[PDB]
Each structure stands twice: as C-alpha cells, then as structure tokens.
Amino acid sequence: LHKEPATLIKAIDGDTTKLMYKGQPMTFRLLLVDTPEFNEKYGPEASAFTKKMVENAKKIEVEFDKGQRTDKYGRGLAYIYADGKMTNEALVRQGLAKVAYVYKGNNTHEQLLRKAEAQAKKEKLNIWS
Ligand SMILES: Cc1cn([C@H]2C[C@H](OP(=O)(O)O)[C@@H](COP(=O)(O)O)O2)c(=O)[nH]c1=O
Ligand SMILES: [Ca+2]
C-alpha cells in the first residue's frame, strides 16, 4: 500500500472527512472502523477527536487498500494519516471507534486495528467503559 497526498477541506464526523484528493473534493469514509453517529453516545467525542487530529496535522495522506476505492455513496474508502499517524487506528486505540465493516480484499490493516481495540477494551476506554 502507498500513501498519497491530500489536504483538508472540512471535518464531518468521527469516521468521515472532506479532503481534496488529486485536486477534487471527496468525502472519505475511514476503512475498518465505526464511530458512533454524532447523535449517539461518544459521537460528539469521536467527531472532536477526528476533527482535531486532521486539522492540526501539517501533512494529511490517504492510503487506499487493495479493493474498492469508493463505496456505494461515492465516498472514498481509505486509511487517513495525520503527520504519519493513522486516524483509523488512533480512534480504535482510544475506544472512540469499533473495528467494523471488514470486507475481504480491503482489510490490510485489520489485525493492527484489532490489536488496538484489544488494548482500548483492556483499559476500559470510552465505548468500552
Ligand atoms: C466502511 C465501509 C462502509 N460501507 C457502507 C456499508 C454501510 O451501508 P448502509 O449505508 O447500507 O448501512 C455504510 C456504513 O457507513 P456509515 O457508518 O458511514 O453509515 O457504508 C462500505 O460499503 N464499505 C466500507 O468499507
Ligand atoms: Ca459511523
């Protein structure tokens, strides 16, 4: 897998963000995770966490997996990095997202993320509290 450049256009919620990629605005949905909707418990905290991570970064990058790159809603499917740190993993490690939506063929970072979810659950963080 390869990292590619992108720039923030605006935050949306814990697991979606609007980025400019190859010069075109696209909403990205984070691979392999599910944050609560803004309305649900920890929804606001997930949104805040992602918003802060992405806007504070100097360098945003997107990394597509081996399979489909856009979902049925036209959202890009990627791992998103903020100054070299993976947002998807960070959300799971903090107990602000569950590993979810693991489709065969777009699952390269599955067991990195499961390792993070185990450690969040062990610490009883947020969703696991
Ligand atoms: C993360 C991800 C979501 N999706 C689709 C499945 C779900 O369809 P449904 O909309 O029919 O439930 C929806 C979940 O996204 P959200 O959690 O953003 O709602 O997006 C994919 O197709 N591929 C993916 O990799
Ligand atoms: Ca969600």
PDB file of all heavy atoms in Angstrom, residues 63-93:
ATOM      1  N   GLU A  63      -4.407   6.517   2.037  1.00  0.00           N
ATOM      2  CA  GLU A  63      -3.821   5.260   1.614  1.00  0.00           C
ATOM      3  C   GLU A  63      -4.970   4.359   1.280  1.00  0.00           C
ATOM      4  O   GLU A  63      -5.705   3.953   2.207  1.00  0.00           O
ATOM      5  CB  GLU A  63      -2.993   4.692   2.781  1.00  0.00           C
ATOM      6  CG  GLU A  63      -2.344   3.342   2.541  1.00  0.00           C
ATOM      7  CD  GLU A  63      -1.569   2.884   3.755  1.00  0.00           C
ATOM      8  OE1 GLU A  63      -2.155   2.593   4.817  1.00  0.00           O
ATOM      9  OE2 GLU A  63      -0.346   2.860   3.657  1.00  0.00           O
ATOM     10  N   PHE A  64      -5.166   4.070  -0.015  1.00  0.00           N
ATOM     11  CA  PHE A  64      -6.165   3.109  -0.403  1.00  0.00           C
ATOM     12  C   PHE A  64      -5.659   1.680  -0.177  1.00  0.00           C
ATOM     13  O   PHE A  64      -4.439   1.427  -0.109  1.00  0.00           O
ATOM     14  CB  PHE A  64      -6.527   3.280  -1.904  1.00  0.00           C
ATOM     15  CG  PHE A  64      -7.163   4.596  -2.239  1.00  0.00           C
ATOM     16  CD1 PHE A  64      -6.376   5.653  -2.749  1.00  0.00           C
ATOM     17  CD2 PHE A  64      -8.533   4.805  -2.056  1.00  0.00           C
ATOM     18  CE1 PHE A  64      -6.930   6.912  -3.035  1.00  0.00           C
ATOM     19  CE2 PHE A  64      -9.083   6.069  -2.319  1.00  0.00           C
ATOM     20  CZ  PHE A  64      -8.277   7.120  -2.820  1.00  0.00           C
ATOM     21  N   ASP A  65      -6.613   0.760   0.042  1.00  0.00           N
ATOM     22  CA  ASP A  65      -6.329  -0.636   0.221  1.00  0.00           C
ATOM     23  C   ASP A  65      -6.411  -1.303  -1.161  1.00  0.00           C
ATOM     24  O   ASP A  65      -6.395  -0.612  -2.188  1.00  0.00           O
ATOM     25  CB  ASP A  65      -7.333  -1.264   1.198  1.00  0.00           C
ATOM     26  CG  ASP A  65      -6.727  -2.427   1.940  1.00  0.00           C
ATOM     27  OD1 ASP A  65      -5.977  -3.190   1.286  1.00  0.00           O
ATOM     28  OD2 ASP A  65      -6.932  -2.563   3.165  1.00  0.00           O
ATOM     29  N   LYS A  66      -6.440  -2.632  -1.199  1.00  0.00           N
ATOM     30  CA  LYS A  66      -6.328  -3.369  -2.497  1.00  0.00           C
ATOM     31  C   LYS A  66      -7.645  -3.431  -3.311  1.00  0.00           C
ATOM     32  O   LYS A  66      -7.633  -3.706  -4.540  1.00  0.00           O
ATOM     33  CB  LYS A  66      -5.785  -4.799  -2.268  1.00  0.00           C
ATOM     34  CG  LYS A  66      -4.464  -4.881  -1.533  1.00  0.00           C
ATOM     35  CD  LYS A  66      -3.263  -4.617  -2.443  1.00  0.00           C
ATOM     36  CE  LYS A  66      -1.972  -4.879  -1.655  1.00  0.00           C
ATOM     37  NZ  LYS A  66      -0.810  -5.429  -2.418  1.00  0.00           N
ATOM     38  N   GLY A  67      -8.775  -3.183  -2.636  1.00  0.00           N
ATOM     39  CA  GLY A  67     -10.096  -3.407  -3.179  1.00  0.00           C
ATOM     40  C   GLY A  67     -10.773  -2.121  -3.606  1.00  0.00           C
ATOM     41  O   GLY A  67     -10.140  -1.191  -4.135  1.00  0.00           O
ATOM     42  N   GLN A  68     -12.070  -2.046  -3.386  1.00  0.00           N
ATOM     43  CA  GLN A  68     -12.797  -0.942  -3.935  1.00  0.00           C
ATOM     44  C   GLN A  68     -12.342   0.363  -3.263  1.00  0.00           C
ATOM     45  O   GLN A  68     -11.993   0.348  -2.080  1.00  0.00           O
ATOM     46  CB  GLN A  68     -14.321  -1.189  -3.951  1.00  0.00           C
ATOM     47  CG  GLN A  68     -15.075  -0.987  -2.657  1.00  0.00           C
ATOM     48  CD  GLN A  68     -16.585  -0.865  -2.891  1.00  0.00           C
ATOM     49  OE1 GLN A  68     -17.342  -0.464  -1.998  1.00  0.00           O
ATOM     50  NE2 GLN A  68     -17.029  -1.206  -4.111  1.00  0.00           N
ATOM     51  N   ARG A  69     -12.232   1.435  -4.039  1.00  0.00           N
ATOM     52  CA  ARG A  69     -11.729   2.718  -3.534  1.00  0.00           C
ATOM     53  C   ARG A  69     -12.826   3.712  -3.212  1.00  0.00           C
ATOM     54  O   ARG A  69     -12.572   4.719  -2.576  1.00  0.00           O
ATOM     55  CB  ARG A  69     -10.780   3.361  -4.531  1.00  0.00           C
ATOM     56  CG  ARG A  69      -9.517   2.527  -4.679  1.00  0.00           C
ATOM     57  CD  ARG A  69      -8.462   3.269  -5.426  1.00  0.00           C
ATOM     58  NE  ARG A  69      -7.245   2.477  -5.321  1.00  0.00           N
ATOM     59  CZ  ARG A  69      -6.036   2.916  -5.649  1.00  0.00           C
ATOM     60  NH1 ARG A  69      -5.883   4.142  -6.129  1.00  0.00           N
ATOM     61  NH2 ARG A  69      -4.990   2.119  -5.515  1.00  0.00           N
ATOM     62  N   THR A  70     -14.033   3.447  -3.724  1.00  0.00           N
ATOM     63  CA  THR A  70     -15.188   4.267  -3.392  1.00  0.00           C
ATOM     64  C   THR A  70     -16.356   3.358  -3.054  1.00  0.00           C
ATOM     65  O   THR A  70     -16.473   2.230  -3.590  1.00  0.00           O
ATOM     66  CB  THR A  70     -15.578   5.251  -4.521  1.00  0.00           C
ATOM     67  OG1 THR A  70     -15.863   4.528  -5.718  1.00  0.00           O
ATOM     68  CG2 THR A  70     -14.475   6.280  -4.798  1.00  0.00           C
ATOM     69  N   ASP A  71     -17.183   3.788  -2.086  1.00  0.00           N
ATOM     70  CA  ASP A  71     -18.282   2.960  -1.683  1.00  0.00           C
ATOM     71  C   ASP A  71     -19.559   3.321  -2.503  1.00  0.00           C
ATOM     72  O   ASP A  71     -19.493   4.136  -3.406  1.00  0.00           O
ATOM     73  CB  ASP A  71     -18.546   3.043  -0.165  1.00  0.00           C
ATOM     74  CG  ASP A  71     -19.117   4.407   0.278  1.00  0.00           C
ATOM     75  OD1 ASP A  71     -19.458   5.291  -0.567  1.00  0.00           O
ATOM     76  OD2 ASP A  71     -19.218   4.630   1.518  1.00  0.00           O
ATOM     77  N   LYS A  72     -20.710   2.759  -2.125  1.00  0.00           N
ATOM     78  CA  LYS A  72     -21.922   2.966  -2.936  1.00  0.00           C
ATOM     79  C   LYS A  72     -22.498   4.416  -2.875  1.00  0.00           C
ATOM     80  O   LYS A  72     -23.452   4.779  -3.668  1.00  0.00           O
ATOM     81  CB  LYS A  72     -22.972   1.948  -2.493  1.00  0.00           C
ATOM     82  CG  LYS A  72     -23.472   2.165  -1.088  1.00  0.00           C
ATOM     83  CD  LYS A  72     -24.303   0.968  -0.654  1.00  0.00           C
ATOM     84  CE  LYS A  72     -24.807   1.193   0.760  1.00  0.00           C
ATOM     85  NZ  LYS A  72     -25.723   0.072   1.220  1.00  0.00           N
ATOM     86  N   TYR A  73     -21.992   5.222  -1.948  1.00  0.00           N
ATOM     87  CA  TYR A  73     -22.417   6.594  -1.774  1.00  0.00           C
ATOM     88  C   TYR A  73     -21.419   7.559  -2.437  1.00  0.00           C
ATOM     89  O   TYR A  73     -21.547   8.790  -2.232  1.00  0.00           O
ATOM     90  CB  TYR A  73     -22.509   6.904  -0.300  1.00  0.00           C
ATOM     91  CG  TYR A  73     -23.550   6.051   0.420  1.00  0.00           C
ATOM     92  CD1 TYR A  73     -23.174   5.079   1.392  1.00  0.00           C
ATOM     93  CD2 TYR A  73     -24.901   6.156   0.089  1.00  0.00           C
ATOM     94  CE1 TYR A  73     -24.114   4.302   2.067  1.00  0.00           C
ATOM     95  CE2 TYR A  73     -25.860   5.388   0.752  1.00  0.00           C
ATOM     96  CZ  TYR A  73     -25.469   4.457   1.729  1.00  0.00           C
ATOM     97  OH  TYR A  73     -26.440   3.715   2.367  1.00  0.00           O
ATOM     98  N   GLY A  74     -20.432   6.993  -3.111  1.00  0.00           N
ATOM     99  CA  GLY A  74     -19.309   7.755  -3.760  1.00  0.00           C
ATOM    100  C   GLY A  74     -18.264   8.278  -2.765  1.00  0.00           C
ATOM    101  O   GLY A  74     -17.445   9.092  -3.114  1.00  0.00           O
ATOM    102  N   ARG A  75     -18.324   7.845  -1.528  1.00  0.00           N
ATOM    103  CA  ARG A  75     -17.246   8.166  -0.543  1.00  0.00           C
ATOM    104  C   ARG A  75     -15.976   7.383  -0.829  1.00  0.00           C
ATOM    105  O   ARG A  75     -16.039   6.185  -1.114  1.00  0.00           O
ATOM    106  CB  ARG A  75     -17.703   7.870   0.915  1.00  0.00           C
ATOM    107  CG  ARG A  75     -19.007   8.556   1.264  1.00  0.00           C
ATOM    108  CD  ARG A  75     -19.438   8.337   2.690  1.00  0.00           C
ATOM    109  NE  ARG A  75     -19.751   6.931   2.900  1.00  0.00           N
ATOM    110  CZ  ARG A  75     -20.156   6.435   4.071  1.00  0.00           C
ATOM    111  NH1 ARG A  75     -20.370   7.240   5.114  1.00  0.00           N
ATOM    112  NH2 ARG A  75     -20.289   5.099   4.215  1.00  0.00           N
ATOM    113  N   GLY A  76     -14.795   8.047  -0.696  1.00  0.00           N
ATOM    114  CA  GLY A  76     -13.532   7.330  -0.898  1.00  0.00           C
ATOM    115  C   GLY A  76     -13.337   6.437   0.338  1.00  0.00           C
ATOM    116  O   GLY A  76     -13.712   6.862   1.462  1.00  0.00           O
ATOM    117  N   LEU A  77     -12.752   5.281   0.116  1.00  0.00           N
ATOM    118  CA  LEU A  77     -12.505   4.342   1.241  1.00  0.00           C
ATOM    119  C   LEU A  77     -10.997   4.313   1.415  1.00  0.00           C
ATOM    120  O   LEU A  77     -10.313   3.761   0.561  1.00  0.00           O
ATOM    121  CB  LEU A  77     -13.102   2.974   0.969  1.00  0.00           C
ATOM    122  CG  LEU A  77     -14.634   2.920   0.839  1.00  0.00           C
ATOM    123  CD1 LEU A  77     -15.078   1.540   0.341  1.00  0.00           C
ATOM    124  CD2 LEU A  77     -15.324   3.235   2.215  1.00  0.00           C
ATOM    125  N   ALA A  78     -10.504   4.764   2.574  1.00  0.00           N
ATOM    126  CA  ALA A  78      -9.031   4.836   2.763  1.00  0.00           C
ATOM    127  C   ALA A  78      -8.648   4.743   4.193  1.00  0.00           C
ATOM    128  O   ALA A  78      -9.481   5.000   5.109  1.00  0.00           O
ATOM    129  CB  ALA A  78      -8.446   6.161   2.218  1.00  0.00           C
ATOM    130  N   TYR A  79      -7.338   4.521   4.423  1.00  0.00           N
ATOM    131  CA  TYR A  79      -6.755   4.818   5.749  1.00  0.00           C
ATOM    132  C   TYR A  79      -6.221   6.254   5.640  1.00  0.00           C
ATOM    133  O   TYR A  79      -5.548   6.608   4.677  1.00  0.00           O
ATOM    134  CB  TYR A  79      -5.581   3.828   6.055  1.00  0.00           C
ATOM    135  CG  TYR A  79      -5.999   2.413   5.888  1.00  0.00           C
ATOM    136  CD1 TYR A  79      -5.653   1.660   4.733  1.00  0.00           C
ATOM    137  CD2 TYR A  79      -6.739   1.824   6.852  1.00  0.00           C
ATOM    138  CE1 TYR A  79      -6.097   0.324   4.569  1.00  0.00           C
ATOM    139  CE2 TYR A  79      -7.145   0.475   6.739  1.00  0.00           C
ATOM    140  CZ  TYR A  79      -6.784  -0.261   5.605  1.00  0.00           C
ATOM    141  OH  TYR A  79      -7.187  -1.594   5.511  1.00  0.00           O
ATOM    142  N   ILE A  80      -6.561   7.088   6.646  1.00  0.00           N
ATOM    143  CA  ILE A  80      -6.171   8.517   6.605  1.00  0.00           C
ATOM    144  C   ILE A  80      -5.112   8.770   7.650  1.00  0.00           C
ATOM    145  O   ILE A  80      -5.270   8.393   8.808  1.00  0.00           O
ATOM    146  CB  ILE A  80      -7.386   9.432   6.900  1.00  0.00           C
ATOM    147  CG1 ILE A  80      -8.443   9.339   5.732  1.00  0.00           C
ATOM    148  CG2 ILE A  80      -6.852  10.881   7.093  1.00  0.00           C
ATOM    149  CD1 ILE A  80      -7.901   9.153   4.360  1.00  0.00           C
ATOM    150  N   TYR A  81      -3.988   9.420   7.261  1.00  0.00           N
ATOM    151  CA  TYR A  81      -2.877   9.634   8.206  1.00  0.00           C
ATOM    152  C   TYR A  81      -2.710  11.113   8.441  1.00  0.00           C
ATOM    153  O   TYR A  81      -2.919  11.931   7.497  1.00  0.00           O
ATOM    154  CB  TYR A  81      -1.577   9.103   7.599  1.00  0.00           C
ATOM    155  CG  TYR A  81      -1.538   7.567   7.452  1.00  0.00           C
ATOM    156  CD1 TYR A  81      -2.123   6.931   6.346  1.00  0.00           C
ATOM    157  CD2 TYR A  81      -0.816   6.785   8.361  1.00  0.00           C
ATOM    158  CE1 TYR A  81      -2.067   5.526   6.178  1.00  0.00           C
ATOM    159  CE2 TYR A  81      -0.746   5.422   8.227  1.00  0.00           C
ATOM    160  CZ  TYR A  81      -1.381   4.759   7.140  1.00  0.00           C
ATOM    161  OH  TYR A  81      -1.293   3.376   6.947  1.00  0.00           O
ATOM    162  N   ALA A  82      -2.390  11.440   9.694  1.00  0.00           N
ATOM    163  CA  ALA A  82      -2.191  12.826  10.084  1.00  0.00           C
ATOM    164  C   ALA A  82      -0.780  12.914  10.679  1.00  0.00           C
ATOM    165  O   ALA A  82      -0.497  12.327  11.731  1.00  0.00           O
ATOM    166  CB  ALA A  82      -3.248  13.269  11.098  1.00  0.00           C
ATOM    167  N   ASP A  83       0.120  13.570   9.948  1.00  0.00           N
ATOM    168  CA  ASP A  83       1.541  13.622  10.326  1.00  0.00           C
ATOM    169  C   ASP A  83       2.095  12.225  10.629  1.00  0.00           C
ATOM    170  O   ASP A  83       2.741  11.992  11.659  1.00  0.00           O
ATOM    171  CB  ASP A  83       1.738  14.649  11.455  1.00  0.00           C
ATOM    172  CG  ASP A  83       1.515  16.091  10.954  1.00  0.00           C
ATOM    173  OD1 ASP A  83       1.736  16.329   9.759  1.00  0.00           O
ATOM    174  OD2 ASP A  83       1.090  16.973  11.741  1.00  0.00           O
ATOM    175  N   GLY A  84       1.761  11.291   9.736  1.00  0.00           N
ATOM    176  CA  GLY A  84       2.277   9.918   9.759  1.00  0.00           C
ATOM    177  C   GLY A  84       1.528   8.960  10.693  1.00  0.00           C
ATOM    178  O   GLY A  84       1.850   7.755  10.703  1.00  0.00           O
ATOM    179  N   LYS A  85       0.581   9.488  11.480  1.00  0.00           N
ATOM    180  CA  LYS A  85      -0.213   8.705  12.436  1.00  0.00           C
ATOM    181  C   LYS A  85      -1.563   8.347  11.799  1.00  0.00           C
ATOM    182  O   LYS A  85      -2.269   9.235  11.292  1.00  0.00           O
ATOM    183  CB  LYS A  85      -0.470   9.539  13.699  1.00  0.00           C
ATOM    184  CG  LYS A  85      -1.127   8.812  14.853  1.00  0.00           C
ATOM    185  CD  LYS A  85      -1.365   9.766  16.021  1.00  0.00           C
ATOM    186  CE  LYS A  85      -1.917   9.070  17.266  1.00  0.00           C
ATOM    187  NZ  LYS A  85      -1.527   7.629  17.323  1.00  0.00           N
ATOM    188  N   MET A  86      -1.950   7.071  11.890  1.00  0.00           N
ATOM    189  CA  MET A  86      -3.198   6.645  11.234  1.00  0.00           C
ATOM    190  C   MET A  86      -4.375   7.008  12.118  1.00  0.00           C
ATOM    191  O   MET A  86      -4.488   6.574  13.275  1.00  0.00           O
ATOM    192  CB  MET A  86      -3.149   5.162  10.947  1.00  0.00           C
ATOM    193  CG  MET A  86      -4.176   4.771   9.892  1.00  0.00           C
ATOM    194  SD  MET A  86      -4.682   3.040   9.927  1.00  0.00           S
ATOM    195  CE  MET A  86      -3.076   2.226   9.746  1.00  0.00           C
ATOM    196  N   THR A  87      -5.271   7.833  11.591  1.00  0.00           N
ATOM    197  CA  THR A  87      -6.511   8.211  12.305  1.00  0.00           C
ATOM    198  C   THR A  87      -7.362   6.997  12.640  1.00  0.00           C
ATOM    199  O   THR A  87      -7.948   6.907  13.723  1.00  0.00           O
ATOM    200  CB  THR A  87      -7.416   9.211  11.535  1.00  0.00           C
ATOM    201  OG1 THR A  87      -7.715   8.713  10.189  1.00  0.00           O
ATOM    202  CG2 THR A  87      -6.747  10.618  11.535  1.00  0.00           C
ATOM    203  N   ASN A  88      -7.487   6.105  11.668  1.00  0.00           N
ATOM    204  CA  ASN A  88      -8.352   4.908  11.873  1.00  0.00           C
ATOM    205  C   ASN A  88      -7.864   4.201  13.146  1.00  0.00           C
ATOM    206  O   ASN A  88      -8.694   3.831  13.990  1.00  0.00           O
ATOM    207  CB  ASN A  88      -8.316   3.916  10.710  1.00  0.00           C
ATOM    208  CG  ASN A  88      -8.393   4.577   9.330  1.00  0.00           C
ATOM    209  OD1 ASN A  88      -7.619   5.518   9.021  1.00  0.00           O
ATOM    210  ND2 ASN A  88      -9.234   4.050   8.475  1.00  0.00           N
ATOM    211  N   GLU A  89      -6.552   3.930  13.213  1.00  0.00           N
ATOM    212  CA  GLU A  89      -6.005   3.224  14.375  1.00  0.00           C
ATOM    213  C   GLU A  89      -6.129   4.000  15.658  1.00  0.00           C
ATOM    214  O   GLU A  89      -6.502   3.472  16.671  1.00  0.00           O
ATOM    215  CB  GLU A  89      -4.555   2.812  14.046  1.00  0.00           C
ATOM    216  CG  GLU A  89      -3.844   2.049  15.174  1.00  0.00           C
ATOM    217  CD  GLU A  89      -2.348   1.968  14.945  1.00  0.00           C
ATOM    218  OE1 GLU A  89      -1.781   2.800  14.191  1.00  0.00           O
ATOM    219  OE2 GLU A  89      -1.697   1.057  15.512  1.00  0.00           O
ATOM    220  N   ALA A  90      -5.881   5.288  15.595  1.00  0.00           N
ATOM    221  CA  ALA A  90      -5.980   6.164  16.762  1.00  0.00           C
ATOM    222  C   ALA A  90      -7.337   6.199  17.389  1.00  0.00           C
ATOM    223  O   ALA A  90      -7.453   6.154  18.600  1.00  0.00           O
ATOM    224  CB  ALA A  90      -5.524   7.605  16.436  1.00  0.00           C
ATOM    225  N   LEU A  91      -8.390   6.269  16.570  1.00  0.00           N
ATOM    226  CA  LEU A  91      -9.773   6.224  17.027  1.00  0.00           C
ATOM    227  C   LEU A  91     -10.023   4.910  17.744  1.00  0.00           C
ATOM    228  O   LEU A  91     -10.564   4.897  18.816  1.00  0.00           O
ATOM    229  CB  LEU A  91     -10.690   6.263  15.809  1.00  0.00           C
ATOM    230  CG  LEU A  91     -10.909   7.703  15.357  1.00  0.00           C
ATOM    231  CD1 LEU A  91     -11.379   7.653  13.902  1.00  0.00           C
ATOM    232  CD2 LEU A  91     -11.889   8.494  16.276  1.00  0.00           C
ATOM    233  N   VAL A  92      -9.558   3.811  17.182  1.00  0.00           N
ATOM    234  CA  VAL A  92      -9.847   2.499  17.817  1.00  0.00           C
ATOM    235  C   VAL A  92      -9.055   2.418  19.162  1.00  0.00           C
ATOM    236  O   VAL A  92      -9.574   1.965  20.167  1.00  0.00           O
ATOM    237  CB  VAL A  92      -9.448   1.384  16.857  1.00  0.00           C
ATOM    238  CG1 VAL A  92      -9.623   0.045  17.557  1.00  0.00           C
ATOM    239  CG2 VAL A  92     -10.409   1.408  15.629  1.00  0.00           C
ATOM    240  N   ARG A  93      -7.790   2.877  19.131  1.00  0.00           N
ATOM    241  CA  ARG A  93      -6.925   2.740  20.319  1.00  0.00           C
ATOM    242  C   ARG A  93      -7.512   3.543  21.458  1.00  0.00           C
ATOM    243  O   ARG A  93      -7.293   3.193  22.617  1.00  0.00           O
ATOM    244  CB  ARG A  93      -5.519   3.197  19.986  1.00  0.00           C
ATOM    245  CG  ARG A  93      -4.556   3.190  21.209  1.00  0.00           C
ATOM    246  CD  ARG A  93      -4.254   1.750  21.573  1.00  0.00           C
ATOM    247  NE  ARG A  93      -3.360   1.668  22.764  1.00  0.00           N
ATOM    248  CZ  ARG A  93      -3.792   1.855  24.003  1.00  0.00           C
ATOM    249  NH1 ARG A  93      -5.054   2.108  24.262  1.00  0.00           N
ATOM    250  NH2 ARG A  93      -2.897   1.758  25.012  1.00  0.00           N
TER     251      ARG A  93
END
